[PDB]
Amino acid sequence: GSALFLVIFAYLLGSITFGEVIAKLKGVDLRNVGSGNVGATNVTRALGKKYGVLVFFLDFLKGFIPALIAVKSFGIDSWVLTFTGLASVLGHMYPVFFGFKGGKGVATALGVVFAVSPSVALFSFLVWLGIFLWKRYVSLASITATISAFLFLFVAGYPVNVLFMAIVIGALIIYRHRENINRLLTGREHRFGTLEVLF
Amino acid sequence: GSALFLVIFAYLLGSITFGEVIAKLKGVDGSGNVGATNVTRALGKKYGVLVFFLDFLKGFIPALIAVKSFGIDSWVLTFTGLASVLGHMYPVFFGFKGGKGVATALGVVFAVSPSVALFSFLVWLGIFLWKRYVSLASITATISAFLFLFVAGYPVNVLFMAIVIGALIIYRHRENINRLLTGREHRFGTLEVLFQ
Ligand SMILES: CCCCCCCCCCCCCCCC(=O)OC[C@@H](O)COP(=O)(O)O
């Protein structure tokens, strides 16, 4: 009853892909820019790093706010949190508002992890930052940090409901990156090299 | 032509009141109503959920065909979603003695607008958890559904369908409304709602 309310709320809140809303009022069509993704990385290409950080924060919140409510209400080992965090990420990937055409859910998933464990969230973000500074592919950093986020929760002793949530979310994130994976293997992925950040 | 076939099929399918047919499957016959709530009443939540899903599908299935084959702007969809609910309210297979059409109407709005449907389901859950009457939640979620379709800018064929379907549902709750105002409506326990 109460759990169903929270899970649906997490899905509806997650369905507000804020990169698509902000770019629309700024006039930009994200479909034609860079990867075509509606997420923070492509919002940065289309609108600049000022709007990319804003979109990252909002997409972060819609996974953090519902997951935190589940933790305080049902406990960290409740499967309500499992499906709440999944709902926020599935809302971002398949938004009920925009015809189920959303992003890859990396920022929203980090919001869910933050509500479960800030410690793991900051480490995974540090892992994401290093891999990115290393190779300047956001997709490679996101894939790596997604896998490291799962390994961090496991070693830290988090319950099987949290691990199940992380596996499904992580497997969904990698699957939504299959276009980036195809581009990385073929040397076509949109790098953030010298020319890209300069211009 | 083919539009009339869909409307009549929507009515006939909606006339399959599923609590009944699944109550008689397992073999049971309180409120005496044909509803998912009245099936959880009797055979447990696991069968009332299935009955809710089936009554949901008979409104969802013909309405999705209307959207896909005629368009969300078509008035074929208006009469198709109307026929499904009217089938559930006045089932030709059961002497026109049927339920209140909440689950069937939710199926109709979900095929038209998955967003409005889930938003209206949020309204129902909140009102039910807050005040603990099933009927008060169904009336409020019905009204909010039309308001959600209106402010979102859905076409006039959909707004007309929601008004007529909403009015029918509210009208089917006239006995619930009387008992609500006279304090004779059943209410769930303060703890019974959370374990519901
Ligand atoms: C299971 C929990 C996993 C948590 C996720 C890992 C944390 C990563 C740190 C946050 C990084 C900032 C947010 C970026 C969101 C985003 O935009 O993701 C899409 C990118 O990838 C690929 O971008 P693109 O080239 O446009 O497809």
Residue numbers in the entry:
A (entry chain B): 1 to 199
B (entry chain A): 1 to 29, 34 to 200
Provide text from the study.
As shown in the aaPlsYlysoPA structure, the phosphate group of lysoPA is located in the phosphate clamp, which is the same site for Pi/3. Our structures show that lysoPA interacts with all G3P-binding residues, and forms three additional H-bonds to backbone amides of Ala40 and Thr41, and the Thr41 hydroxyl. Furthermore, its hydrocarbon tail is anchored in the hydrophobic groove as seen for 16 : 0-P binding. The release of the product inhibitor is probably driven by high concentrations of the substrates. In addition, the exiting Pi along the Pi-release path might aid the lysoPA clearance by electro-repulsion and competing for the phosphate clamp site.
By contrast, the recently identified membrane-integral PlsY exists exclusively and ubiquitously in bacteria, and uses an unusual acyl donor, namely the acyl-phosphate (acylP), representing a unique class of acyltransferase. PlsY acylates G3P using acylP, forming lysoPA and inorganic phosphate (Pi).
